[PDB]
Design a protein around this nucleic acid. Structure first.
Ligand SMILES: NC(=O)c1ccc[n+]([C@@H]2O[C@H](COP(=O)([O-])OP(=O)(O)OC[C@H]3O[C@@H](n4cnc5c(N)ncnc54)[C@H](O)[C@@H]3O)[C@@H](O)[C@H]2O)c1
Ligand SMILES: [Mg+2]
Ligand SMILES: [Mg+2]
Ligand SMILES: [Mg+2]
Lengths: 133, 181, 419, 121, 188, 101, 173, 222
RNA sequence: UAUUUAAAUAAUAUUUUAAAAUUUAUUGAAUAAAUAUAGUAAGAUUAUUUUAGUUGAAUUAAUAAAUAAAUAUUUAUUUUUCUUUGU
């Protein structure tokens, strides 16, 4: 007769898999077909006062991460739109093309806001009589 | 094909050529927006045996003359930085080319290099030409004569050449320009 | 069964009766015997000229590129194309002239076609794209509903985990480029097969159905279900083209047979999708384009299902006017830089040429604009002359206010935006 | 976005030039645009058109100021803010709310010039 | 702010960029003419959509024939939002094309006063062999083969196997072919 | 026994039944592993036969090229010879004379 | 509810444009086509009339006229002053425009028919014999088209010999 | 028509499901055996991270001078009129997808000489592009616009009368608007020192430099 | 800071039966909801006649060291040699 009917299921976030942890630790570099995820070298460790008195050894250099970890992270990005092999994986950091395509679709051709990086641009100068109860 | 690093190690060249052994010679790269013609590859194409005659590089290159003209006009062939020129046509008028190659809207040549299974970011590339009109098989045979060892397929819409990069797309564009399309 | 299967030929006797019939069965005389239906090429549809009549100057032959004329006949008035002829990447590269017909089954005159519209040589990939999109869109998506385990209340009765749902089903999105390309290729395929007929008008003396049937009988239009169907593209006529259909013929064309009238257009609206991320839960209908193509458009499926294609001269004019800008934009630059030289881009808006022929509705709208243009005179937001005081203005950058303002003769003209 | 007045029109009535002059005729003398303040963000931005006491409505007042600017009708009322360019009378004013001292043209003119001369990059 | 008319915007005006005596180059404005044609078509279409009238041919929905297909409020909003902006875009295109036509006339006069009539006529011509191809292929059949069906080009027309056909009447006016078939291979 | 469903090859000769291993001439797992290791070592020694050649700033890996360029772009504005910026990351010292050096 | 492109709904040239129709079928009979057109027109009219009734009831409940113009606008209309900044063309004007366009089209059709009949008479009295198009060098003619063109000539055309008659090898009639 | 079984290839339906792990996978430890997390091994260079696109970072979209020259030689853009972002978008030399605040950067890639003077208005043009345009004779003007200014430039038809546009932010002013090297559009206003003396004199005017459109006409040929 | 070559703007989903009592209420241990969730125990998962590689390896928590190996899908290098060789 009548029971609990199932409705449409909401989709996940388009940038759900990309992690701020990765965006803070690593960064992507290189040509499009030879991208490498690199993080700064050195050993991070907290020790007592009086250790590593010489600073010349501590170097700020970037070394690439292991290829298996790079493949795992890239696959985490590749999760979205898996069936279309003709679509290149997403990027660790969103680019200008991505921010533009976020609203360049024809379903956003009427909205004046959200266009040309409204959320990215700093706010406008508010009115001088601006006040809230 | 000279190994500058090996020559420097053996003592046949001066040790100041390490930059030459490491980095290639700086040249304006051929692009879809900057037709940087390469005289060496064009001479190689002229030396290669083909049935159709190609125009001279002097006519393929845009003219470079004095720029004292006060106002510019709409000449078909004028000074251009990116090296854009209308199609010159066939080299010998008393001939019939079995195929015709149309350009795109921006005047770019049909050569487009894609990748096989690009989701995995695969380095293996291939070239697709989908603006050839006329006898596609004559164009395919000319591509055979150009790239002997490559796999070249043909369909009603596109001609595919597998295992060729931009380094082959530029050769294809050079041959097309020399032919006159 | 399958060809390479043992179960394919275990029925070794009894399939046929040893005794033949006495009315239809006959013996093979020899090589000089003409068997009914025998043909060397595999023809799943063995229709011939008599059964499926083609209406064209010549029967489509391998010597002729297209079965229609190639040069205007000196004993018939020739009508050039409304818009100038350009040969694009896919055009047949040959002149095409169709013998326009009248409502009395008589050739009136000869009108030249457009190779961009009726010269784009067909291609199986695009035809299949069109056919697949149409056959996947026309299916009813509201009847795909199914039960689920949470919807079944007390296995056989317990529904499946992932059942088919009207919202879960997909409705694809097709771009206007491929749509127009496939429609043009289908029109060219009909032209090549020689089943395209151009009529001046599609008008009935009475809006009833018997007058429609009498017209079809007089001009030998087979409309029966079993016979070859008809696909009309009504657009009015050459002098008075109309986007809408003629009322009398549109009322009379409702016959049980195989005849379908479609809108005189080959393009389509750009399909939008506002539920791409499944934001609105209570939406009912398939995912994808929420603005599908209506049924009364020209399509590969209906074109294949209906034998003859009868296009009107009004439809021809409308198609040419709609595809003019497209076939002009497709051209490469070293070709399109010569259109104003040859006179192809003489726009009547600048006053270069007299306004060209337009449809009834478009002419009405244009006259409405011409009459309403008088009200936009004493206002600064006049659309026909916007910002008519820039070169006589003075821009001042007031830093205390942090704004750039437009003063004229010492008076502020710029308007401060309200929030 | 639909509640407050953000990028959105509030009056959907567009009158002719003669109708604006008739609407501005009912304005009582001694009125000024600086009297009507901007309503807070917790108030709906609606306009009832040209009705009685329409000048009291902040959104209706300035919207009428925008249409006359397009039609070229001389705005009889003043401006929303009167800038103080030169030191004149009164040479001192009284304010118990610390708003007039900040909104002064000269008070913010020196602040912008402070940031302009402060750039040293 | 007049960046649409082709001149410098108010930002350039404030910057004081001297770009007025810049240059006078000939320009065909073909792309601008195409865009003007598109804008004119769009304006006419917007007017036709705004002037829609209910024309119901069925008796059930017959009580609407006199009304507009829009609610007057939405009709006013449409007129102010899209129909009035299409005209502004059309005017922008027309102004740009008129400025370019003025500059073209000046360049034509300069070429006529410098080189000569026929010299200017040849210098301001864009005709190319591929242009002759695109505009008239019959003057290009000899130069190259540009047909989608290359086997029917008159250069390669010899390949089409023209058969000996005949119309038999005993079959009902049916065209058949006279030459015999070829014995196809059957087995190994 | 890592793969637990062995391949069944087409039997062209009856001795393919008696044979167990697919490629008999091919060395076993560990033997071919150490063989490939020795071959890679020999190739690396052939590559490092000559001295470690130093590369300019353009012919550097991406994680060092931009850093080395920005460390000296400040001095690149003033064209004067004899200006070195001792950067941390870069090609390490070989420790012996080199013809490229 | 939610967001839906109401600005796109009602913008197409016909009623069937910009409507989410996912309940149709690949083949529609005569009754199916009539019901489809009926449903589209009825959907459009329902939307329009429901919106109009809603807004008029809201105006009447707020106390304004059914159009939406208040007492000030009514007093201006009494005085005679134009209330609208841009007076849009009305139904009578649009119908008059359509009528005059139809009439001009009919007159042009009559004149074109007269001129075309004159040219037909001229060309028929000039050319009694079929031109070079009546050839069989490339393909066979179509008997249907020949029977249709019969009326334009004096000599019978449908009488076709079994041999592919060519212009050069044999004289025609 | 088959199952893509991991470590086993492509198997037919109804085959051996015994040695199957792709099902459990769809439903490494040997690398994490030593408790070595990659996300905790390397430290963070900053709280925001490398290449953090914060408000005001001024991440421009690349626009190749070679591409611009190609478009001009093609005929999409008219070199007579001043080049602007609106003209670019209308000539369709750049699609709408590449547009994002801040507008563009003029990159001179693969160009060594500009034969004709080009008068273009963009943001944060490279030094080589600026000097090439200056050598050719054209005049570049860096127009760093705010968000509303950029929207008004891209869609001017939505604005019948000029409106008060707010000046850019402090970072934009100190970087591009008031930078003589980048040829900003406020460098002259910033160099003008008379505005600092008196507030009434602070207002600086500027005028255009100097050397209807009704589509219906009359049949004058008769 | 910008002196280096490309590209088919498309997202929606992802086994099944089960391995556990806490939940939210009602009626005097039963009643009705929960595909709620178990690092996830265990099983079942529908389609012959096929056309090419390895059959016990790999195993370095953590500053500048050439490289983990197996299994499987796609995909690439025709150079010499007396024959052979799945890189
Ligand atoms: N963010 C924004 O504020 C924004 C965005 C896009 C366009 N605009 C345009 O800016 C202008 C002023 O905006 P605002 O926020 O200061 O006021 P507003 O748009 O909120 O109000 C303007 C008033 O004038 C009327 N009006 C608008 N255009 C008119 C025209 N062409 N003719 C006659 N009356 C007209 C409006 O309906 C309203 O009554 C308008 O043209 C508006 O469309 C503003
Ligand atoms: Mg995240
Ligand atoms: Mg990996
Ligand atoms: Mg392997």
């Amino acid at each position: 007769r009548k029971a609990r009917r199932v409705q449409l299921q909401p989709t996940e976030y388009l940038a759900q898999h990309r992690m701020q942890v990765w965006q803070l630790r690593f960064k992507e570099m290189g040509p499009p077909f030879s991208r490498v995820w690199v993080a700064l070298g050195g050993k991070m460790r907290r020790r007592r006062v009086g250790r590593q008195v010489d600073v010349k050894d501590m170097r700020y250099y970037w070394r690439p991460i292991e290829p298996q970890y790079q493949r795992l992270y890239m696959s985490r990005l590749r999760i979205r739109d898996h069936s279309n092999k003709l679509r290149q994986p997403m990027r660790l950091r969103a680019t200008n093309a991505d921010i533009g395509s976020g609203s360049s679709s024809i379903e956003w051709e009427r909205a004046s806001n959200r266009k040309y990086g409204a959320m990215l641009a700093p706010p406008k100068r508010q009115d001088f009589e601006f006040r809230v109860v | 094909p000279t190994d500058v690093a090996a020559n420097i190690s053996a003592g046949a060249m001066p040790p100041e050529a390490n930059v030459a052994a490491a980095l290639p010679v700086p040249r304006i790269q051929y692009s879809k927006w900057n037709r940087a013609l390469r005289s060496d590859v064009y001479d190689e194409l002229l030396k290669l045996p083909l049935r159709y005659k190609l125009h001279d590089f002097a006519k393929l290159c845009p003219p470079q003359r004095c720029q004292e003209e006060p106002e510019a006009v709409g000449v078909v062939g004028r000074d251009s930085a990116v090296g854009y020129l209308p199609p010159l046509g066939p080299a010998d008028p008393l001939d019939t080319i079995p195929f015709f190659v149309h350009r795109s809207s921006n005047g770019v040549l049909p050569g487009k290099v894609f990748s096989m299974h690009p989701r995995n970011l695969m380095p293996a590339f291939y070239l697709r030409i989908q603006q050839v009109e006329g006898d596609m098989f004559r164009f395919e045979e000319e591509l055979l004569k150009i790239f002997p060892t490559k796999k070249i397929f043909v369909r009603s819409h596109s001609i595919y050449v597998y295992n060729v990069a931009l380094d082959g797309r530029m050769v294809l564009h050079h041959w097309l320009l020399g032919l006159g399309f | 069964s399958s060809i390479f299967s043992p179960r394919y030929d275990w029925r070794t006797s009894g399939v046929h009766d040893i005794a033949p019939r006495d009315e239809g069965d006959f013996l093979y005389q020899g090589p000089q015997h003409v068997l009914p239906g025998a043909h060397p090429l595999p023809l799943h549809h063995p229709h011939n000229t008599i059964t499926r009549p083609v209406i064209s100057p010549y029967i489509p032959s391998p010597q002729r590129s297209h079965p229609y004329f190639t040069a205007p006949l000196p004993e018939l008035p020739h009508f050039s194309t409304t818009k100038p002829i350009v040969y694009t990447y896919g055009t047949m590269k040959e002149r095409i002239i169709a013998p326009v017909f009248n409502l009395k089954n008589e050739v009136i005159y000869t009108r030249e076609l457009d190779p961009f519209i009726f010269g784009m040589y067909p291609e199986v990939e695009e035809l299949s794209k069109n056919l697949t999109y149409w056959m996947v869109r026309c299916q009813n998506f509201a009847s795909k509903w199914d039960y689920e385990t949470r919807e079944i209340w007390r296995y056989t009765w317990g529904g499946r985990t992932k059942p088919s749902k009207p919202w879960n089903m997909l409705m694809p999105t097709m771009d206007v480029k491929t749509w127009s390309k496939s429609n043009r290729m289908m029109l060219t395929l009909k032209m090549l097969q020689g089943r395209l007929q151009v009529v001046d008008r599609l008008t009935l003396e009475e809006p009833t159905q018997e007058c429609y049937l009498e017209l079809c009988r007089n001009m030998s239009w087979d409309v029966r279900h079993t016979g070859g169907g008809v696909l009309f593209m009504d657009g009015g006529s050459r002098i008075t083209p109309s986007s809408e259909f003629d009322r009398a013929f549109f009322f009379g064309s409702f016959f049980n047979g195989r005849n379908k009238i479609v809108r005189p257009t080959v393009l389509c609206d750009e399909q939008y999708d506002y539920n791409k991320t499944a934001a609105k839960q209570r939406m009912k209908g398939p995912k994808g384009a929420k603005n599908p193509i209506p049924i009364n458009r020209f399509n590969a499926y209906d074109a294949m299902k209906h034998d003859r294609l009868v296009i009107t001269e009004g439809a021809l004019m409308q198609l040419e006017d709609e595809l003019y800008e497209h076939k002009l934009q497709i051209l490469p630059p070293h070709i399109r830089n010569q259109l104003p030289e040859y006179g192809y881009l003489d726009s009547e808006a600048l006053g270069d040429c007299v306004p060209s022929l337009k449809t009834i509705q478009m002419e009405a709208a244009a006259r409405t604009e011409e009459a309403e243009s008088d009200m936009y005179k004493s206002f600064i937001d006049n659309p026909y002359n916007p910002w008519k005081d820039n070169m006589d203005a003075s821009y001042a950058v007031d830093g205390a206010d942090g704004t750039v303002q437009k003063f004229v003769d010492g008076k502020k003209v710029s308007w401060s935006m309200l929030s | 976005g639909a509640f407050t007045k953000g990028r959105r029109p509030v009056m959907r009535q567009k009158y002719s030039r003669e109708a604006l002059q008739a609407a501005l005729a009912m304005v009582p003398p001694g009125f000024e645009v600086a009297d009507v303040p901007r309503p807070p963000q917790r108030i709906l931005a609606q306009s009832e058109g040209i009705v009685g006491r329409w000048y009291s409505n902040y959104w209706t007042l300035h919207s009428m100021r925008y249409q006359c600017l397009l039609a070229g009708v001389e705005w009889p009322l003043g401006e929303r803010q009167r800038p103080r360019t030169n030191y004149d009378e009164p040479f001192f004013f009284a304010d118990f709310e610390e708003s007039k001292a900040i909104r002064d043209y000269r008070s913010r003119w020196i602040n912008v010039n402070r940031s302009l001369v402060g750039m040293t990059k | 702010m007049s960046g649409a008319f082709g001149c410098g915007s108010y930002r350039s005006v404030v910057a004081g960029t001297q770009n007025v005596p810049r240059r006078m180059t000939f320009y065909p404005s073909a792309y601008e003419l195409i865009q003007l044609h598109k804008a004119h078509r769009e304006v006419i279409r917007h007017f036709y959509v705004r002037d829609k009238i209910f024309d119901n041919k069925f008796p059930g929905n017959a009580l609407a024939n006199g009304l507009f297909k829009f609610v007057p409020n939405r009709r006013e909003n449409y007129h102010m939002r899209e129909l009035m902006e299409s005209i502004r875009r059309r005017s922008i295109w027309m102004h740009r094309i008129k400025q370019q036509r003025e500059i073209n006339a000046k360049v034509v006069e300069n070429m006529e006063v410098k080189y000569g009539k026929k010299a200017a006529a040849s210098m301001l011509c864009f005709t190319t062999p591929d242009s002759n191809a695109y505009f008239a292929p019959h003057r290009y059949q000899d130069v190259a083969n540009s047909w989608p069906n290359y086997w029917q080009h008159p250069s390669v027309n010899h390949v089409v196997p023209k058969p000996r056909w005949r119309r038999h009447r005993e079959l009902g006016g049916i065209t058949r072919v006279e030459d015999p078939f070829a014995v196809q291979a059957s087995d190994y | 026994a890592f793969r637990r469903l062995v391949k069944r090859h087409k039997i062209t000769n009856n001795q393919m039944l008696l044979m167990r291993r697919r490629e008999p001439y091919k060395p076993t797992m560990k033997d071919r592993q150490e063989i490939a290791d020795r071959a890679k070592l020999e190739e690396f020694e052939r590559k490092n036969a000559d001295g470690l050649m130093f590369v300019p700033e353009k012919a550097l890996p991406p994680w060092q090229k931009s850093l080395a360029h920005n460390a000296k772009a400040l001095g690149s504005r003033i064209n004067f010879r004899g200006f070195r910026v001792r950067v941390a990351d870069g090609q390490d010292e070989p420790g012996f004379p080199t013809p490229f050096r | 509810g939610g967001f839906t492109m109401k600005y796109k709904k009602g913008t197409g040239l016909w009623d069937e444009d910009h409507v989410n129709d996912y309940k149709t079928n690949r083949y529609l009979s005569a009754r199916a086509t009539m019901r489809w057109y009926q449903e589209m027109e009825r959907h459009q009219t329902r939307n329009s009339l429901n919106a109009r009734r809603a807004t008029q009831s809201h105006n009447n409940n707020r106390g304004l006229h059914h159009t939406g113009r208040g007492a000030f606008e009514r007093e201006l209309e009494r005085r005679g002053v134009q209330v609208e900044k841009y007076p849009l063309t009305t139904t009578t004007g649009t119908m008059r425009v359509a009528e005059l366009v139809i009439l001009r089209r009919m007159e042009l059709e009559k004149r074109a028919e007269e001129a075309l009949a004159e040219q037909r008479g001229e060309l028929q009295k000039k050319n009694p014999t079929p031109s070079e198009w009546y050839d069989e060098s490339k393909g066979p003619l179509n008997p249907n088209f020949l029977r249709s063109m019969r009326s334009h000539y004096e000599v019978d055309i449908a009488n076709l010999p079994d041999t592919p008659l060519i212009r050069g090898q044999r004289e025609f009639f | 028509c088959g199952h893509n079984m991991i470590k086993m290839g492509w198997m037919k339906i109804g085959g051996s499901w015994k040695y199957s792990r792709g099902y459990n996978d769809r439903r490494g430890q040997w690398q994490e055996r030593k408790m070595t997390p990659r996300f905790m091994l390397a430290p963070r260079v900053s709280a925001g991270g490398p290449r953090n696109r914060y408000e005001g970072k001024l991440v421009f979209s690349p626009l190749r001078l070679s591409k611009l020259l190609w478009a001009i030689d093609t005929g999409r853009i008219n070199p007579n009129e001043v080049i602007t972002l609106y003209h670019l978008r209308q000539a369709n030399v750049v699609g709408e997808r590449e547009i994002v605040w801040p507008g563009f950067v003029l990159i001179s890639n693969g160009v060594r000489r500009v034969p004709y003077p080009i008068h273009i208005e963009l943001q944060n043009a490279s030094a080589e592009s600026i000097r090439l345009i200056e050598e050719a004779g054209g005049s570049f003007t860096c127009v760093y616009m705010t968000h509303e200014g950029l929207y008004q430039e891209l869609h001017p038809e939505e604005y019948p009368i000029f409106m008060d546009q707010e000046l850019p932010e402090r970072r934009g002013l100190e970087s591009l608007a008031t930078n003589p090297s980048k040829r900003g559009w406020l460098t002259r206003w910033y160099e003008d020192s008379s505005k600092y003396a008196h507030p009434a004199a602070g207002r600086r005017y500027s005028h255009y430099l100097k050397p209807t459109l009704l589509p219906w006409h009359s049949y004058n040929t008769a």
